[model samples]
Each structure stands twice: as C-alpha cells, then as structure tokens.
Target: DMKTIAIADRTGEYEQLFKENDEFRFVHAEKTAEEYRKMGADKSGIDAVLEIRQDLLEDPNAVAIYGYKQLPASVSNHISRILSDYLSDKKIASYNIPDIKQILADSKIELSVHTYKWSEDG
Candidate 1:
C-alpha cells in the first residue's frame, strides 16, 4: 500500500521547491529505508525512518495527515548530497540526531529514532 504524491503547497520551502522543480518524489517507509541505504547509511541509521514507515503501513489512514510525506529516492539523493557536503565543510562526521530532530520539529515534522535495524545487506 505504498503511495507517492507531490507536495501540494503551503508547507513552506521544502514543499515549494518540489512543486517548482516538478520533480518532487516521496515514498513509503520501505522505500525510504532503501534510499537511505543506497546513500551509505547503515541499517542502524535508516531504522528511524523505516520504523515510522512500518507504523504507518499498519494503519495509514489514521495517520495519513502527518505520515507518508517523506521524500523519495530522487529527492533523498539530492538532500543526502547536500548534507554530505555540508558536513564535510564543517569537519563533522554526522549531524546530531537531537538537533536534527528539533529542526524538523520546528518545521512541523516529528522524528523518531528506533532500535530496530534493517538488514546489513540493505
């Protein structure tokens, strides 16, 4: 029951960028994990996004408003590149989880980290 939709509007810069580029892509949890893995994120790092996908998969309608809005492979690849470059510039291995979470939360998105790990093989 996976679905992808272009962000309509009024969600701010993220949504507007997609709408303007005409290439906004977003997928479900399963795809999100796959995308993260392809970006060199280990199973542990992708678990957070995957767990949310699983939760939504179980009852998508209930959380449709807030769930399933994450970017898909194309956009994920773009963002990952930007993040990688940004981290490199700052001499950082990775962004702090809590800080990133707060940033997203401030943008009206909630994030959760989970202990579960996807397959090592991705």
Candidate 2:
C-alpha cells in the first residue's frame, strides 16, 4: 500500500505542524511543480527532493523539510519513489514525513506525502 502517489496539502495542517515545532530544521520552496520536476536525474523531481533530504541526512540538527506554496503531486511522487529505497533498508527504523500518513512508517524516518495541486494547463 506504500506507493508514490500525488496528494495535495489543501488544509494547512501539515504546514502548521512544521511551523509550530522548533525541533525541526525545515526548508520551504514556492516553486511550481514543474520547477521541482526540473530537479534530479533525467530532470525528475526525486533528485530535487533528494538534494534537500541529503542535506538533512547529513545534518544532525535538521529535522524535516517544509515545502510550502505551490508544489505538485508529480514532484512529491518522485520524492517518495526515491525515498522508498532507504525505507526498505533493514537497518532503518522510521522517517519524518509531511502529509502522506503511515506510508513509510516502517522506515528509519517517516516520510509524509507533500501537498500540491496539479496544473491543469500543463
């Protein structure tokens, strides 16, 4: 059931949780989904998302990424697909997530699904 799927963050619940928490190291980007998709291998969104995750993984203080504004499902799904590798590792425990609930709960860090709306014009 844990798959890379597109989900939108319409409610502010995820953003609010990140904002209210100080223990996390968060980063926000307002780029459209296309901008995100431009990042990573073969211009895939996973690579872009990986760049940020790599930073957090290296930094002991960083807790999570707070992607704000207009991110899209295409971008988020890419992120999840990439993270699935790490989550499948046996040495890990859990992962930090944004919104996709319980998808990667078994990973060393919980990965939440990011919220974004599809651009109908694209």
Q: Model-by-model lDDT, in order?
A: 0.36, 0.36
The number of residue pairs in model 1 that clash at the backbone is: 1
lDDT of 2 by residue, 1-122 (tens): 12121222233322222221222222344454456655523433222222232232344233222232344564545444544444344224343445334443533366578869888995
- In Å, residue 71's CA in model 2 sits off its true spot by 0.5
lDDT of 2 at 7: 23
- TM-scores, each model vs. reference: 0.23, 0.23
After superposition, candidate 2 runs with Cα above 4 Å error: 1-63, 90-122
RMSD of each: 17.4, 16.3
Name the regions of candidate 1 deviating beyond 4 angstroms.
1-20, 24-71, 92-122
Worst 10 residues of 1 by lDDT: 47-56
Roughly what TM-score does model 1 have, to 2 decimal places?
0.23
* Model 1: per-residue Cα lDDT over 95-116, one tens digit each: 6665765554466533546657
